[PDB]
Every structure is written in structure tokens, then in C-alpha cells.
């Protein structure tokens, strides 16, 4: 179809879990090469069965992106034996440390992939925001904020090139950091959800899929809030 | 049955779909696998419709609705009903000297109640089958200047605000309400000047806003309510 | 009969307003008489209106009790005839008023109603005012959020879409004549309302606004009072949020 | 009903980058309303032509060297305002810093946090407060854009850690302003400039400190977390 990736290599960090393993299976499944990283070798282990088991073609590997030496040298492997990625997707993650630290990460792992995606002419960045999930209203609506910030002026700085930046906000999602909240926190989130359901991870890895798309390809700087209806801020 | 993106046994309605961008949509969600009808105000535009479904494949249909009557949307929507089956998809695109900055609020004002009296009509079938997917399209940027910049910002404000409260009143029923907001899409040789406040750096095509709603339409954006996708190659003007 | 037109050498240095003619719509209780005393405090001559007899009365006698010049009318901010008929009686009276603020409101398909009601009596009303700010080259239109906070949070989000909008809008469309339009969005503001929730539920509410307090009205004309001042003037298009820290989007 | 506390008689209030233009008009503002202003600047000229600023319009305070992207600055500078002056409670951050996009949001934000969490334990033994962020005044769009989102957020999330106190924490986005930057544009260019602004005319950097003194005011008391946009109507996201 026209929503096919076949011939691109996707970078997806944080890939060993949840919305980020989504993420990984989805670009495959729409035709991608992925690459999905994880902290430790178990996960990149772990990363790479997964792959296998549903078919896809690629490569679970070690990153640590508060490190410019394991981003530099991660992307250069990456270069050599699978080829550039010209998709990538940051899923991998004192109010104001938390959220500086991230964007932080965000722009160091952005710069290093923007060389290969200058020289091909082609791109998509798509920046994962942090779930929902019980301080906390606090540091959600400052990361959302700095988030659609962010993806927002390197949309920018970035377009002349046809590379998009994008982000996905999601909401209140079923995962293995939300299955074990208290029942009466959980009820409270529920009841703040038109939707009247938590999402899914598949669900936001559908729109990451779309976004990396051609057909998305007008599609720069926004943020797509994926939260079955619930906006706080 | 299911499958990743396909609206095979859904019927689409998709207003104004005579030309650009509408035309596209229904096109779009035509590929996808629906059964379109498209609509037009005049009947030789609904003739044209009809024409183009037929050349491209699609099964559907072309009317005849005016949004702003009341009657118009009955009959219009009985007719479907009793021919086609309920439609669980709708786009709407219908919207009415150098243009002002004095033209904003009328223009906003009489969509938005369009808007309500079509959707509220097709909520009852969508209701009744507990799935819906209503998608509003934002008008294009219009004219060059300050009084082109102040109806443009001003549409979109009333379309984000009124996507989002509907989403929010329909939400328990399995219904997504979602809008997508045009930038610059498809004369005067400041053309170069429009390109340069783009960071693409060129025009979007109407094709690229009807892959949007097609996702939108999808079983994947199930997730995905009270949103309004900007698609405008970077420029962002409120 | 109903009347429906009620009247009524110590130099305050709070005198900002210059003799010049406020109105005040829905200015007999809370947020709206608030305003009107803010306002006539500053120094203006304030006219506040209520939709019935009674209320334009009260508000005359709050305004006298108070040492404010002014008057209370009656208003019906959703009728053509209304607008028309009060603002040539003000004209005729007591002058042309280039401080408008707008508060009469209406409150409970109720969701889109509401919102598309108000708006429309604020463009009515708003367009009405203009020829005489536009004479004048000077004007404040001030709109008051209903995006007030104990409306409550279901359509709160939609009415603070549509006015920020809205205020935006109308704000560019007169911009050139020297004339600022902007709102002023309430969060929790203490009125007859709140004191009277159960403390369980009050504890609760606090606990969302990072203040831990409700506002008071006076809080909001304070606000009012400064983007109607000539410091405020090259404030347009802006909703000010007044909510002690609590966003709800 | 007429005599109330909009006056800041008693307050000493701190004013980075008072040297010129907007934050000099918002350290006159400041003092015109009765508080103890120390205005900083980065040299040892600028701080002395911040003092005699301040006597020639009869306004009680100091001029200060302040680096606020040293941490050994502006604990040393706020220590001295201790012992000299007394507790700065009115605190307003106009000192900047200078693909360059992100690194001078990034590095103004530090800069923003290492000096608010500074003056926040006088603040929060006073039980009141008042801290305002400036924005910049106006590839051009993208830098602007950029700032005012990442103050919006900061300011919003730094109001929430610390409302519980009684302190206030907003910011006031200016548009196009009158000030050095903008003597120098060609003709060709500010016209087209002023054609985006509803009033039709550049800000004044005074129309700036109004709006600060306001917010410094018990008035503003309900306050907080909010970008006040002062820009004549010309609204660019
Ligand atoms: O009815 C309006 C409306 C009418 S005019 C208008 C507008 C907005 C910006 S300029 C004019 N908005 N709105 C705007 C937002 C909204 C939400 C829910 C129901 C109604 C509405
Ligand atoms: O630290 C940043 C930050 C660093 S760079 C940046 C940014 C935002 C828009 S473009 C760059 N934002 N932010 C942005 C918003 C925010 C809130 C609370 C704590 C931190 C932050």
C-alpha cells in the first residue's frame, strides 16, 4: 500500500516494553527495518526475539541517549551493517531535571540521526510523550509543554531538508507501568476519559505509523494527542 | 472484517465534495474500501460526483445537501438511510472587493452551526451502532494579508474549540470527533514571499489532508478524539 | 410602575478614569458588582445593569452607598432592541461609554447553545459600543470568562476556547482605532455558590489549586481595572487566566 | 473602599539586566511604586549606571554585578543583598544569555531556575512573593516562538511548586518593543512589521513595566502561572 516503509531502516528507542515494543512492531509490520534499542543486553536481547517472533526484520541494540559517546557510537554501528535510519522514534526516557533532562536527550539524539536524513533529503523524527499515570499533574503538563515546544522549532530548523518532527501526547494507556496504580487512582483516570477506556499501546503506535508515512508527509510540528478525549494541563 | 485500514461495509459522507480537497477525501475513503456519498449545493455538482465515483471505482453515490436548512439535512439524511444504509463516517468540508477584517465572526459563527446540525442529526445512528468517526475540515488559508490571517486563525480557534467539546459530550458512545486544520494547499507572484513562511518550503496537496482523515477514519485513530491535526508543511499561524 | 433607570471635593489618588463613562453588564452580585465598584473606585463614572427592575435598583443603591457615580439600567443583552434603546438612553444622559466590560452571561445540546449564545450577545453588544470608541479613537472592551471555574469543568474548556478566540479576533478587526480587547478567564472564585460545599468535597477542590484557596471577586477587578488603566494599553487580543495556578484544558 | 495596598512601600524588589531599555523602564516602574529596587547588570559600568539611574529619579537601591549563569554569582550577590538591604520578595528576571535554537532557550531556563530557587527561601520565610519572567522581544519566529513556549511552560510549573506559599510566579511576553534592537530596522521592513500589529505602532518599554507592577501587586494575588502577551495585538506561535 502507500502506507508501506519497505526499503527504510526505523530507529525506535526504548523498545523492550509497552508502547515502545509497539512502536517496533508496527513499523514492521508496515515494512520497516527496525532497529529498536534498549539500557541493558538482556532487553536488547530480549528486543531482538521479539522482532523475530513477529517476523520482522532488524536488531535489538544497546543505547544509553544521556551519553553523546553511546549515541555516536550506537548510530555508527547502525550505519554500518544495517544503513542509515531516516525514521526515528524517541520513546526512551527535581520537576525541572526530569523535564530538561529529557529534551536534553532528545536533542542530542536528533542532531547525530539529522546528518544521514540531510544527506538522503528525507525524514521523520516522532517524539513520544510521557504517559499518564499517578507532583505528577505537575511534571505531565510541564513534559507535554516542553515536548510540543520542542518538536516544534526543530520542525523548523529541519523542514527546508523534507524531514517532519513530530510528536504523539498519549493519555492514560494500558501498560505495564499503569496495570498496577491503585484501583481508586485508577477509577479517578477513568472517570476523566470520554472514551471511558484506557488506550492502548497499539493504539499509539497506529498513529507513529502514520506519521512516518508518506501520506503524513505535510504533517510538521504538531502534536497528536492521543488520549481518548481527556486534556489536562 | 479487520484489517489495518479499511472501511469495507462503512458508508462515508463527505459534504462539499465536488472539487480540492473534498474531492480527495472521498476519493480516499472510496480506496479505503467505504461506500462514499459525496455532496455538492447544486445539482450539477452532485451529477459531477457521481461521475467521478463512478470513473474511480467507488460505490456511492452524489446529493444534493445545503447544511445550512434544517430540511435539506433530513431529507438528505433519510434518503441515505433508505437507499445506502447509515452513514457512520462524516467529513464535513461544506463551508459558505478584497475580503476584511471585519468578515470573521459571521462566516466562523454560521460553520459552526452547520457543523452542529449535520452532526447532531448522525448522531443517532451512530449512537444506535456504538461507532463513529465525525471529521471536520478547517478552511484554507484564504487571502494574503492581516484581514486573510484574522478570519484564517479565527476559523480554526472555533473549529478546535467545538471538535474538542463535541468529542467530549459523544466520547461514552464510542464516537471519535476529530478536525484537520489546512495551512497553505493548492495566482499573485508573492508566491515566493508564502513559500518562504512554509518550512517545507512548497504548497500541500489536497491528497495530503485526504490521507490524514483516512487514518483519522481507521480503527487505529480509535484512540484518538477531540484533536485537531494541523497539516501545513510547518507554518503555524494563530 | 417598574422603573428601569435609577441615578447615583475629596480627590483619591486611585482616580485613574477620568470622568469616563464605564459599563458594566450583570453588575448586581459577585464577580459583576465587583467590577462596577473597582471601576468607580478608579475614578470612572460607572453605569451596571441587571436584566430586571429590581436589580437595576440594587445596583443604584450599592453605587451610592459606595460614592460612585453612575447609574443601574436595564439590559437584555440578547435583544437588538435592548442594546440599542439603553445605549442611546446612556448617550443622552451621562455620555458615550468607552470602558465596556462584559459579564452578563448565560449559563443552562446545552453545551453548544450556551457558548454560540454568548458569544453572539458579545459580538452584539461589542459592535453597538464601537461607533462611539471609534469616535473617540480611545476604547476598552473587557470580557469576563461562561468560563467561570464553578460553571464547573465539563464546558469550561469550550467557552475559554471560544471567548480566547473570539477576543483574539475582534481584538485585530479594531486594533487601529486605539482600541484594546481583551478577557479575563476565572478559575475558583468565592460566591454564594462555593461556601456552601461540604468540606470533604471543598478539601478536594483546594487541593486542585496550587494557591489552596478560592479567589475572591475583588481579585478579578483588580485585574479589570488595570487593562482598562492606559498602562494596559498596548495589552490586546489577551485572555488573562485568574485562577490561582488551577488549568483545566 | 479607596485606600488599599497596590503601593510596594517596604519591598525590596530585584530587577536583572536593568541596565537599558526594558529593564531599566521596569526598575523605574518598580521604584516609582515605592519599593527598594537593586538592579543587576553583567559589567561593573552597567551597575554603576544603574545607581545613578536610580538617584536621578529618586528611587532607594543599588546597582549590582550579577552573572545568572553562575551559581558562585548569584549566591555571593544574593547574600550581600541580605546583609546591605534586606530580602528581595519582588524578583524579575530580565537578564538573557547568549541551530543556536535550543541552547539559548535551554541555557535561559537554567539560568531562570538556579536564580527563582535562590530567592525562594526568603520568599517562602515571608509567606509572599512575587517572581516575573520577561520573554525576549521579537528562522526570527522560530527563536521567538521557541522561547515564549519554553517560558510558558517553565513559568506554569514553577507557579505550581510553590502557590501553596503565597508566591506568584508568571511572565509577560513582549511583542515588538521600542528599544535599540528596533531603532535600526529599515523602513521597508517596519512598515511591514507594524502592518501585523491591530494597534499599528511598537510597543514602549514603559507599557512593559506597567504591566510587571501590576502583577507585583497584592491586586494580582490570584495571579499565577500566567503569560501576560503584551504585543499590540500580533500574536506569533
Ligand atoms: O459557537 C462558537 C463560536 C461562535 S463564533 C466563534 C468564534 C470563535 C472564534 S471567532 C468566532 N465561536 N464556538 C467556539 C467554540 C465553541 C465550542 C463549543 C460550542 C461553540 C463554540
Ligand atoms: O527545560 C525546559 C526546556 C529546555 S529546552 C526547552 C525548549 C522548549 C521549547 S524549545 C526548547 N525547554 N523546559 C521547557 C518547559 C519546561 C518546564 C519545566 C521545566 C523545564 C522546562
Excluded: C
Amino acid at each position: 500500500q502507500s502506507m508501506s516503509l519497505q526499503g527504510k531502516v526505523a530507529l525506535v528507542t526504548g523498545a523492550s516494553r509497552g508502547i515502545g515494543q509497539a512502536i517496533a512492531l508496527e513499523l514492521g509490520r508496515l515494512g520497516a527495518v527496525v532497529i529498536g534499542t534498549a539500557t541493558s543486553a538482556s532487553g536488547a536481547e530480549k528486543i531482538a526475539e521479539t522482532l523475530k517472533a513477529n517476523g520482522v526484520e532488524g536488531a535489538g541494540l544497546v543505547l544509553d541517549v544521556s551519553s553523546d559517546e553511546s549515541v555516536a557510537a550506537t548510530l555508527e554501528h547502525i550505519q554500518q551493517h544495517l544503513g542509515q535510519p531516516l525514521i526515528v522514534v524517541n520513546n526512551a526516557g527535581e520537576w525541572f531535571d526530569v523535564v530538561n533532562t529529557n529534551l536534553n536527550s532528545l536533542y542530542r539524539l536528533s542532531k547525530a540521526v539529522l546528518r544521514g536524513m540531510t544527506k538522503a533529503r528525507w525524514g521523520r523524527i516522532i517524539n513520544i510523550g510521557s504517559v499518564v499515570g499517578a507532583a505528577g499533574q505537575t511534571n505531565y503538563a510541564a513534559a507535554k509543554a516542553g515536548l510540543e515546544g520542542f518538536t516544534r522549532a526543530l520542525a523548523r530548523e529541519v523542514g527546508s531538508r523534507a524531514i517532519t518532527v513530530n510528536a504523539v501526547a498519549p493519555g492514560f494507556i494500558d501498560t505495564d507501568m499503569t496495570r498496577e496504580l491503585p484501583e481508586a487512582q485508577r477509577e479517578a483516570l477513568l472517570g476523566q476519559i470520554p472514551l471511558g477506556r484506557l488506550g492502548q499501546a497499539e493504539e499509539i503506535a497506529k498513529v507513529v505509523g502514520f506519521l512516518a508515512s508518506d501520506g503524513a508527509a505535510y504533517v510538521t510540528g504538531a502534536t497528536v494527542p492521543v488520549n481518548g478525549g481527556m486534556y489536562m494541563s
